[PDB]
Amino acid sequence: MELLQGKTFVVMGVANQRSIAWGIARSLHNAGAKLIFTYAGERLERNVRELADTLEGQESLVLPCDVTNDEELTACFETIKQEVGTIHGVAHCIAFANRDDQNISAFSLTAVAREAKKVMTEGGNILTLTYLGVAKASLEASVKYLANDLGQHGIRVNAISAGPIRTLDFNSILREIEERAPLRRTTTQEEVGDTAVFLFSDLARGVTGENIHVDSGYHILG
Amino acid sequence: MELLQGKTFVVMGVANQRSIAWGIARSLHNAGAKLIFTYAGERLERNVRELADTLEGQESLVLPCDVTNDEELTACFETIKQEVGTIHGVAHCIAFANRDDQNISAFSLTAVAREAKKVMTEGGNILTLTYLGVAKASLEASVKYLANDLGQHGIRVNAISAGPIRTLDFNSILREIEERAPLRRTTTQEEVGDTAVFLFSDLARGVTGENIHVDSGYHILG
Numbered sequence: 001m002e003l004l005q006g007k008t009f010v011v012m013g014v015a016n017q018r019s020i021a022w023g024i025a026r027s028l029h030n031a032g033a034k035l036i037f038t039y040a041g042e043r044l045e046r047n048v049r050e051l052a053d054t055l056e057g058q059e060s061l062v063l064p065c066d067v068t069n070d071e072e073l074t075a076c077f078e079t080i081k082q083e084v085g086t087i088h089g090v091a092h093c094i095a096f097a098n099r100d101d102q103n104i105s106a107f108s109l110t111a112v113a114r115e116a117k118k119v120m121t122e123g124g125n126i127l128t129l130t131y132l133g134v135a136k137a138s139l140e141a142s143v144k145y146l147a148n149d150l151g152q153h154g155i156r157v158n159a160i161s162a163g164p165i166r167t168l169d170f171n172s173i174l175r176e177i178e179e180r181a182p183l184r185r186t187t188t189q190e191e192v193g194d195t196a197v198f199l200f201s202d203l204a205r206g207v208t209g210e211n212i213h214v215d216s217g218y219h220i221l222g
Numbered sequence: 223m224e225l226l227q228g229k230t231f232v233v234m235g236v237a238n239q240r241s242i243a244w245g246i247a248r249s250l251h252n253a254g255a256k257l258i259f260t261y262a263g264e265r266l267e268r269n270v271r272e273l274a275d276t277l278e279g280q281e282s283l284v285l286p287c288d289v290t291n292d293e294e295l296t297a298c299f300e301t302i303k304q305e306v307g308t309i310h311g312v313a314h315c316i317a318f319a320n321r322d323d324q325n326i327s328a329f330s331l332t333a334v335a336r337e338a339k340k341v342m343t344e345g346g347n348i349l350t351l352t353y354l355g356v357a358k359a360s361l362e363a364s365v366k367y368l369a370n371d372l373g374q375h376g377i378r379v380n381a382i383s384a385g386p387i388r389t390l391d392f393n394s395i396l397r398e399i400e401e402r403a404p405l406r407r408t409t410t411q412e413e414v415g416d417t418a419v420f421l422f423s424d425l426a427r428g429v430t431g432e433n434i435h436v437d438s439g440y441h442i443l444g
Contacts, residue, residue, distance in 0.1 A: 151404030182373030191428030206413030208439035217430035
């Protein structure tokens with residue numbers, strides 16, 4: 001267990017193991033953390049129900065929450081103050097539809113954040129993900145700005161700029177990273193999830209408004 | 223124990239508990255890690271000898287190493303391939319003399335790195351510290367450049383931009399952070415050390431050439 005001991009989080013954006021957020025999900029569960037999951041709609045319900053039980057432990061809620069509309073979020077986070085009391089972070093992880101692009105998260109964090117505030121009474125972290133222009137820039141500012149607007153209540157906001165991962169020309173991009181990335185290799189759901197367990201942990205209590213690149217060091221290039 | 227399990231590191235720049243690097247030091251030991259320590263000279267020898275034994279466990283080497291001259295480094299890292307075999311990281315932490323300013327680390331990392339390469343056969347991390355212009359800029363590039371020059375051998379290079387800590391006008395700066403920093407409060411040797419245990423851990427294996435600010439979110443401001 002340990003590190004995320006007696007702690008519980010929402011994981012959004014999960015759909016089909018291959019998904020980046022199941023990656024994060026496992027990585028948090030193994031740190032001994034409890035976790036609610038959400039689903040975007042009809043077809044994404046069964047998949048998220050299927051995956052939550054391939055994990056052992058007291059199985060946790062799988063409530064419906066598409067992010068582009070209020071009630072589903074508002075009532076979805078309403079339920080938590082009413083069913084689990086309080087949580088310790090949120091894992092804004094929308095990375096679908098045209099490779100996560102336009103496409104989302106950019107205008108789904110603020111609301112998502114605002115809602116998190118009320119069910120995160122002790123503090124913790126609101127992670128959001130960037131899967132490797134205008135919307136990278138907004139979301140960038142949105143974090144900075146949320147970091148500082150929700151600091152004093154104990155909420156940290158932090159991003160992960162995550163580089164390409166095994167089939168989640170293209171065939172070229174992947175090699176290009178095996179060839180240029182400082183670590184000469186692409187990334188995995190796992191490197192991305194283990195970064196997360198830190199940001200959510202007690203070790204990352206001074207790290208707020210940061211943005212950690214899980215990209216083999218690719219960012220340092222041009 | 224755990225996280226840094228069966229792992230061992232060099233911690234430089236430690237002098238007088240108050241020192242930032244003893245902070246990092248404890249934070250690594252508690253993660254179950256073995257650690258060599260170095261000292262800048264005559265008076266800094268006894269202090270580093272004194273502190274290494276206030277920590278339990280098989281006590282580890284306290285060899286002499288001032289960083290501005292080769293042999294003391296070269297032979298100091300020579301000893302390791304000859305006495306401990308191999309290590310998993312280095313904690314370049316020079317933060318003394320005029321508040322760590324000019325003043326050092328800027329031209330002590332490269333050599334320090336080069337030497338680390340030979341005693342880090344499996345990989346790991348070379349942390350370097352920035353305790354909150356020209357020398358911040360060099361050191362910044364030095365990392366980027368070392369990150370990418372030592373990537374493929376499994377070495378990650380990473381920095382910590384660390385914000386002011388309790389007495390380590392000034393009286394004003396401290397309040398200014400309690401007042402403006404997103405987390406409305408200054409930092410501790412501890413927030414700085416627990417960040418480190420991550421970068422050195424297996425969780426931070428995709429994080430290379432990053433630079434994590436342990437500054438209550440202060441960096442996001444202007």
